[PDB]
Symmetry: C4
């Protein structure tokens, strides 16, 4: 079916007919590189490096020509070249490489003769320094992003409705597949249904907050163990008189979990959704925590998504 | 007209007669570079590099002189120089460059003869290492800033007043021109009018909070689609008995949207304003979202700022 | 005994039977390196470097062979090698090293003859650049983590119950063993007891918030001096009719302190716990702050954990 | 007088008799370097670099000896050294330098003869790479800290009491000496008085929150202009029946301003204090904002701290 958020939590919209997109991306380069695909990113990385090399190699070759350093121009024995041992565009590129990387073997070096050569080298160096810096920074950040981290936190596949403490509650389960901690986490659902007009031309989406509680309905400092989040279905509930039955109803229960990560201080956001068909009536998550002889608690994720009837 | 915040959200104040500004900027160098103009920043970048080069080149030339390494001083065949192949200030600069960048060709190298040369090189290296680090860090950060990001979020051009759910509401529209998400966003307006005294000498600006609501008047986790923010004009409203009519009134409705960015964990703040003349009476934003055959929602920004009369 | 959080605040759970763990770690490499053990991390660091070296050395040796550059292949005096001075896998590795580190002595350099050599070098450079960057970034971050910082903040060893301002209060003490400040700190306890079912197969842990107050029960901006945190044991208390006596009761009072660090803007979280046996009845922390002639306050941590009876 | 926080906002406590301080600092190296003095930090920076150089130079000299590479050991014309052109501890150090920095001139290079030399070089490289990284990271961060930034935000020198809107209010003034913005700022005062016991042995400090309001008593998104913060002295006030008169009373009004910075996403905290003597009765900050012909507001900091009587 059509849905707001993919079951794993990826965006499910496209945008169209943005005027002046290109210029706007050119202004905000940094973000544009951080958000770009990986293929084109690798390509741009390698191209930056080797293409700066190549361009400056052609440039150095031209400087050589204009000064006649080439061999079969028949330079006199008097002739000090603008650069040493450069008489082919190949060696030109090779010197571009040796100097810009700063490998600097020493079989080709600059000579005191040509000043334009000197300034040209300084320019090459400064610019390529800049570009190296920029690209490496974007690459660092694009790895560092915590989206990918989100995958090691998992919602239940199914939401289930039953009597908890005598109150009708819709229940979901969350867990963390790593030892590193999430902190300051908070669960907040939104409820999103369908409003059709005159036409299939437009839709107004009416959001409704749904809050989810654990103990005091506040937040949970640490997501130590698979946490059971439940929401009160009483007349305060925007869900109350939904068609509570099997399958029918035109809605989506978007679920959001936002909280800080321990080792990076980044805010990390997991998302997923529940369809009217995905919700189950009168069911009980098999408790997924058991204790062991060595003395502390075990989270066995074979039962995480298991349910049985009440 | 005079305004608090430029329509795009840039500061519109100047400060004057700050005593001891210069020293204060010299203390806080880091921020001072991060906040400085780009031109002077590039200039300072290149100058740092090449001027360290130049200074140490002069220094090396002097060391050469004091040791008589120059050629037409007629050094005996006995003579080991403080440095090899340095007999001109040109080569001096060239060695400064080759060592400080660590290009190190090898046609000019240090010799074991002069110890002062050695310490001098170590100093050059350590200091220039420091400066390189500092400047590159400031450059990284100054790119990374999220102000520029703010431009890819856009407020409506016009605020419009009408009956929403039967309540008189002032309405604005927001949207995001990129696929990357904003999170934890919150809209808060302030109301700023004009208080004149005895003189044109001074003014007290009285702020008044105005809150803006969407569904529950709480916040919206994600800015997926162009969001309609509305404020209740009832007697709780600081706007209530403003001259609600066309144009007149001496005020500014400053609008602020603050929230975390997904890919960087940075807090991002958009701002703009509304003048008494910019506000429109009895108008309806054409709904800007439509659905498509492939199945999910389209945000067509040609209608974003479009209105028609109710 | 079995406990939730180790007395110092380390996690005390294991997870089991995670399906598809390996692929999931391969997706999220960055975090996986940041969270990995130090031994394997050093190993992987050094291996990256020297093994890239070694692989490309073998590669260069092969290029040499295919071009017959080896000596006892008896290369004619006509013969320009793909690389200079490479006729042994040893020198191959040595050139890999000299170029990839960019040490570039110059006794072995590339020649204009073989283009495949050139592209091969460019590839070596680009890839090894990438890997260097990644590993150094993960290493930086893994140092930077503030967990280790947490150890310089210390809870009391014992929680003690007595009449503070006439109200029965459970009391703990916190302190900071460094001059650097913590800011925005907030103390929040959870109460965790034991719910057994039919079987030793599963357990539901019921959390209950416990709030801890100092002056106004709000938060404390700065943790200047050893702070006494106390909780009101009245009928609002989830502790109220616990077996308040010596030792008995099946619970754990988990204590959490979350707040921003000054010099890094990182959020820092200390944790520890209290067992039913660790709690003491009718006791008074000896006040740990005294003033001195030079004029300001001294925090003497010999008394920090000292108590005497009321 | 004795005070909690220095008028500018520096900590005014010392800690004493911390057991196991040294080991604890050795665990948390990163923070320990970030928090250490600048002198010792520069010293440690330069020492790391040049001392790694020096140690490995001695090491290389020893390898030379053990292989007899020294000249006046009279090496036969047959003799391939472990290293080229190294026959003095001086050149040893020079090669340490040329390789570890990767300056690599080429007058001294390694030869294929000695494998131990090779591994030794690889080790030198890897370790020194590590250390370089660590130190540069700590240096970056230690600059980046926003404490120093705090100095460009200034509280009033004097707190003043008077009738604002008819309510008795204690009033202070804040301002920002830079164009860069602070965001999400919040002012919160604490009130700290003196509780003496039996002895001059100990003191319990009782904190009391004091909230400070501007318009709605909420927070102020941006600190555009010098902001007047006022607190309501009515019977809700912990200040209410203080000795409201000149000078007397044994207290300190600690003032805290916490908020995010624009260009770095760092949280920035300004602090200062007010003594019972520093507070003034019946006084009015001269309004410090005036408008100008060019059209927008001017903050003239000559009047910032000026007052006159009501
Ligand atoms: C290093 C590295 O990451 O290279 C990635 C590589 C090439 O990039 P690739 O063409 O696949 O582009 C990625 C692809 O679009 C993913 O689907 C995106 O994540 P998502 O689905 O939208 O969520 C991802 O964006 P983000 O996740 O980075 O933001 C894109 O980068 O992917 C393959 O292995 C293709 C094998 C065929
Ligand atoms: C790289 C790079 O960014 O170079 C910028 C370059 C020179 O710098 P430039 O003189 O223009 O200085 C920039 C200019 O003042 C902008 O207006 C500022 O933004 P805003 O208006 O106040 O909002 C900006 O500050 P910030 O945005 O960085 O903070 C300033 O840096 O600008 C041109 O292309 C001039 C073409 C003629
Ligand atoms: C540099 C550097 O840090 O090397 C560490 C080194 C080898 O690593 P090592 O085998 O000990 O692995 C560490 C060990 O597991 C610790 O116990 C972990 O902390 P914790 O106990 O779970 O809390 C730590 O994880 P984290 O703290 O980094 O996250 C692990 O890295 O440790 C020794 O000195 C072994 C001496 C025998
Ligand atoms: C570069 C660089 O910063 O060098 C600093 C340099 C040497 O360091 P220095 O001995 O002064 O040590 C600094 C001094 O203790 C300051 O007072 C400290 O700040 P504060 O007072 O406690 O607040 C500062 O700590 P932090 O501010 O960095 O945290 C310390 O680093 O200081 C001089 O110019 C001495 C001139 C005689």
């Amino acid at each position: 079916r059509r849905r707001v958020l993919t079951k794993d939590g990826r965006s499910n919209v496209r945008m169209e007919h943005i005027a002046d997109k290109r210029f706007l991306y050119l202004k905000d380069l940094w973000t544009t590189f951080i958000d770009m695909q990986w293929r084109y990113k690798l390509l741009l990385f390698s191209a930056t490096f080797a293409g700066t090399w190549f361009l400056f190699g052609v440039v150095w070759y031209l400087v050589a020509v204009a000064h006649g350093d080439l061999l079969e121009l028949g330079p006199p024995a008097n002739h000090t070249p603008c650069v040493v041992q450069v008489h082919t565009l190949t060696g030109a590129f090779l010197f571009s490489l040796e100097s810009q990387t700063t490998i600097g073997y020493g079989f080709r070096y600059i000579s005191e003769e040509c000043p334009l050569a000197i300034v040209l080298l300084i320019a090459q160096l400064v610019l390529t320094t800049i570009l190296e810096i920029f690209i490496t920074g974007t690459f660092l950040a694009k790895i560092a992003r915590p989206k990918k981290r989100a995958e090691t936190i998992r919602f239940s596949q199914h939401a289930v409705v039953a009597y908890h403490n005598g109150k009708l509650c819709l229940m979901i389960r969350v867990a963390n597949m790593r030892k590193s901690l999430l902190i300051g986490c908070q669960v907040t659902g939104k409820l999103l249904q369908t409003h059709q007009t005159k036409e299939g031309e437009n839709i107004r989406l009416n959001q409704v907050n749904v809050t989810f509680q654990v103990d005091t309905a506040s937040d949970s400092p640490f997501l130590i163990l698979p946490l059971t989040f439940y929401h009160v279905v009483d007349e305060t509930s925007p869900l109350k008189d939904l068609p509570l039955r099997s399958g029918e109803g035109d809605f989506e229960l978007v679920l959001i979990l936002s909280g800080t990560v321990e080792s990076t201080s980044a805010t990390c956001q997991v998302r997923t959704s529940y369809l009217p068909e995905e919700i189950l009536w009168g069911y009980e998550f098999t408790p997924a925590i058991s204790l062991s002889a060595s003395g502390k608690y075990v989270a066995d994720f074979s039962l995480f998504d298991q349910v049985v009837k009440v």
